[PDB]
């Protein structure tokens, strides 16, 4: 509350002058060729989420938190992205993922195809397929890595290797008979039968890789963790069949094996740590589940061996799941963990020849603010009671969701319940089963060689092209021309 050092104008003037001096020194543009490209992706991380995460990260270290800087706040260049689809005003996951991974805007609910295909129709897919930036990186001799905290066949990762007309076709068990009769494949099959030389894979979704009614390894007695494939095909087994016999393939499935490898003796790695989505950061286990930072570190150490570079796609996709349920603490802690992973990855590599881009695909209706004083806990009450019904209200509020509570005709009296719990849902305006998305523009932070080409307010599909220009891959090879 008003620290002493901040009571003197010279402090602020000196801060501003130092910032101006750094900005002046920044005028020397970096026009090197980006040998390495790293793309961090926060699912459902708008502009309120990032500032709330900054405040929470500051307050976790016993600070007011407003002045603290995230690892993504040190990125020199910031731009704005418009996130509309060609079918929907409010975006989705699959369409936006296609937009920023393939460079072409697509319909709502279809992965990897153009806007000419209709959802849930497999005969409109033929001839309308679009290849992502992962194929461009692989065709130039670079290494390929996908690291996710969600399923490996979720919308956001699958928009990079799959061409399907529906998101909900995770496995052949989930596809209708009419689609199966037309020779149309699911996403788990396409993960293994589309690009056969993907170097690093990290994520969950271990029950989509095994035949039906097959007991799991971690959960013996759980009937929800069994296999689901009706084809009877072991995709883990067939993954160790498309690779040369003189190479090394491991298929680790827990943290003890992950922290026992020698990246100088590993060439191809597949890690499936959970039957479905990986657990939250607050609910994670010490022993049998690795965090995002360790997985990113191991993936970078494995991919660093290639003398031509690598492309790594890191996806912290539990922020969206945390926001959809109305639990703000889980989403904010996932954002903090994502920031820590960004810091670790930046520490491993060097900024002289690596292009790091942190971005998001959409935003939610999360809001906060009640004229709270300095140093107030971000999960705390507002200073004043309500003017009308004379009851306390929290700072964090959702536009709509399952937090809408009215007990008998009056809204909930927050002072009775434990509003600092891990599983507390903030109050909302419209009662729904799930918190929806938002139409706001998203922020894109960039750093590295040729990182200044993301400067204004632009479309989402503009993002991949710049990377293809910086790494001298793809359809525009004008950076390497003499």
């Amino acid at each position, epitope marked *: 509350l008003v620290p002493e050092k901040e009571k003197d104008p010279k402090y602020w003037r000196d801060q501003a002058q130092e910032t101006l001096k750094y900005a002046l020194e920044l005028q020397k543009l970096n026009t090197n060729v980006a040998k390495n490209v790293i793309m961090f992706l926060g699912d459902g991380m708008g502009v309120s989420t990032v500032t709330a995460a900054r405040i929470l990260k500051g307050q976790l270290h016993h600070n007011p938190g407003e002045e603290t800087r995230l690892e993504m706040d040190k990125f020199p260049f910031v731009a704005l992205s418009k996130t509309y689809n060609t079918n929907a005003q409010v975006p989705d996951s699959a369409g936006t993922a296609t937009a920023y991974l393939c460079g072409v805007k697509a319909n709502e609910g279809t992965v990897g195809v153009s806007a000419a295909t209709e959802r849930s129709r497999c005969n409109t897919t033929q001839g309308n397929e679009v290849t992502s930036i992962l194929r461009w990186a692989k*065709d130039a*001799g670079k*290494s390929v890595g996908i690291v996710t905290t969600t399923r490996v066949n979720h919308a956001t990762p699958s928009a990079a290797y799959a061409h399907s007309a529906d998101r909900d076709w995770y496995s052949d068990n989930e596809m209708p008979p009419e689609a199966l009769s037309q020779g149309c494949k699911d996403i788990a099959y396409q993960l293994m039968h589309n690009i*056969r*030389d993907i170097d690093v894979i990290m994520g969950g979704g271990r029950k989509y890789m095994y035949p039906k009614n097959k007991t799991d390894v971690e959960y013996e007695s759980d009937e929800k963790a069994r296999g689901t494939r009706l084809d009877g095909l072991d995709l883990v087994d067939t993954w160790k*069949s*498309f*690779k*040369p*016999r*003189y*190479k090394h393939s491991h298929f680790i499935w827990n943290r003890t094996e992950l922290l026992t490898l020698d990246p100088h003796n590993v*060439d191809y790695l597949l890690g499936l740590f959970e039957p479905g989505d990986m657990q939250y950061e607050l609910n994670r286990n010490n022993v049998t589940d690795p965090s995002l930072s360790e997985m990113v570190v191991v993936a970078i150490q494995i991919l660093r*061996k*290639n*003398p*031509k570079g690598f492309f790594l796609l890191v996806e912290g996709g539990r922020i969206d799941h945390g926001h959809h349920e109305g639990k703000a603490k889980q989403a904010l802690h996932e954002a903090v963990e994502m920031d820590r992973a960004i810091g670790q990855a930046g520490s491993l590599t060097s900024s002289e020849d690596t292009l790091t881009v942190v971005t998001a695909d959409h935003s939610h209706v999360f809001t906060f603010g009640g004229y709270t004083p300095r140093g107030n806990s971000i999960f705390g009450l507002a200073p004043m009671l309500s003017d009308t019904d004379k009851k306390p209200f929290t700072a964090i509020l959702y536009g709509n969701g399952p937090g809408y509570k009215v007990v008998g005709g009056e809204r909930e009296n927050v002072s009775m319940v434990d509003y600092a719990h891990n599983n507390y849902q903030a109050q909302s305006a419209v009662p729904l089963r799930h918190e929806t998305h938002g139409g706001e523009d998203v922020a894109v932070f960039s750093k590295g060689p040729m990182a200044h080409l993301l400067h204004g307010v632009h479309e989402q599909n503009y993002v991949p092209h710049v990377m293809a220009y910086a790494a001298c891959i793809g359809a525009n090879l004008g950076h390497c021309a003499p």
Partner: single-chain antibody
Amino acid sequence: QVQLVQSGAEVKKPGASVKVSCKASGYTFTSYGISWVRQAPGQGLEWMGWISAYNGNTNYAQKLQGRVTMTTDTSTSTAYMELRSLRSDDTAVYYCARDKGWNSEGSLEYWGQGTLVTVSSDIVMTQSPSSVSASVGDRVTITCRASQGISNWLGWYQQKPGKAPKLLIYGASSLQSGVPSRFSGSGSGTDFTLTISSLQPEDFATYFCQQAYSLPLTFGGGTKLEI
């Protein structure tokens, strides 16, 4: 650009060792490995081994193990073979070839000029047909079959009389840069096809299919596309 040069001919005697040197220029020496191929007079290509120029690890063919020594020198950027206990059937042409990249080390992209040495559960690759004939402007297809499933690890090579083999298609579906788009490759698993839609007078040569699945690397029998 990248170029590899070898020494002159070696007229030896049985029991005497022979040394072959291959010097490469135009690239970073430690970033690529060097493989060694042998071709008997009038027969198909044969593989001996390779050596990595980064860590020095070597792989030798089991048939010729105990007689081949492969060394590398990054100071002068050279690769050496030493062969011992020469037999009456060791006369051949020895080629030094350079792989394509990091994980594509089974595709021999750049080849040496060839040294003529004169002395005093492997995957079997079958290729059909053997002596196909055609005319200018026609369309021809050649099939290659493997004894085991090799996924998409296959390469197609072209060799004219008196010249080193040339890489055309790697991965059975990707065309090497600089090759005309007339050539096409297709297939996966066991059976693969190479097709020429419009034949040209400068495309009459012998074609080979080489697998990069498991050691030792095996070359096809060769199809003589005559006029």
